[PDB]
């Protein structure tokens, strides 16, 4: 019956962005009221959020993860940067909403929370909604790395290390990306209407 957005937004644990989680939302009635009551980011693309309770979609996805505050702006169509290019990429024609909030109180700890990782290097940009969880050594220079770290040869994931005294641009933010897809197929995820 009611779509389980609470399992996504109020999950006690969130994914590392390089291993970002997707929840598919389907065969359910979607109450979007919680969006209008809190969030530090709430941007939508191609859809008016106050209309969602009167709209139907064929697929709805909720993608979630943790990044730094000053990276939230990269979660938008058209953006570039290590997160948009190497970790989580939206398509140019994204239709949906990007929601984030400061999670310093849960995701940082004294001495540092290193549990959250991101991909610092990649040979090419991700395609939209691509996920890369590989751990090959990254060749930054002319010399082949032969699988071994060294000058110009780097392990590709890095830990954020969130400390509660970080400046707010470096604190952890939880992000949910809602995709509303209107496809050539019956639109069976509707609001109450």
């Amino acid at each position, epitope marked *: 019956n009611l779509c389980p957005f609470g399992e996504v937004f109020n999950a006690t644990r969130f994914a590392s962005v390089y291993a970002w989680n997707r929840k598919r939302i389907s065969n359910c009635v979607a109450d979007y009221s919680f969006l209008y009551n809190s969030f*530090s980011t709430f941007k939508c693309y191609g859809v008016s959020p*106050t209309k969602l309770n009167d709209l139907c979609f064929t697929n709805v996805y909720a993608d979630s993860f943790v990044i730094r505050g000053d990276e939230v702006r990269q979660i938008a169509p058209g953006q570039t940067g290590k997160i948009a290019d190497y970790n989580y990429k939206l398509p140019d024609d994204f239709t949906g909403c990007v929601i984030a909030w400061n999670s310093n109180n849960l995701d940082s700890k004294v001495g540092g929370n290193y549990n959250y990782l991101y991909r610092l290097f990649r040979k090419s940009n991700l395609k939209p909604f691509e996920r890369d969880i590989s751990t090959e050594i990254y060749q930054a220079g002319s010399t082949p790395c032969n699988g071994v770290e060294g000058f110009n040869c780097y392990f590709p994931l890095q830990s954020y290390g969130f400390q509660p005294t970080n400046g707010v641009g470096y604190q952890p933010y939880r992000v949910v990306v809602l995709s509303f897809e209107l496809l050539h197929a019956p639109a069976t995820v509707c609001g109450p209407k």
Partner: nanobody
Amino acid sequence: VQLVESGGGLVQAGGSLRLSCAASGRAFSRYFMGWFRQAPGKEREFVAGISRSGGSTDYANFVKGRFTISRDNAKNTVYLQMNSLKPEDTAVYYCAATVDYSGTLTAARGREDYDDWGQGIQVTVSS
């Protein structure tokens, strides 16, 4: 880019007011524009938003049809017409701008979604 607000002031409950916010520069048709309010003892909260062409508007749940956001790109100005004002609406009102890089931004409500702010104008609705 500098944003400069005008209008506002004191008004009797049930009355109306218009705020405006004029932007410097030549990039104004690129901007999604928002209005925010900051009332005594609360953080800044979203009121209304408008897409760069004026095709899409977006209102907080407390607007209840009472306010209209509009823009005139040829005057670099966004407006907030506020009707049927309540004392609950007393607050410092801010203008804000964010660049619609993808050309598809239809809402922006977070404090951290905007990079340029107007100076704030006090609006006071008396009982």
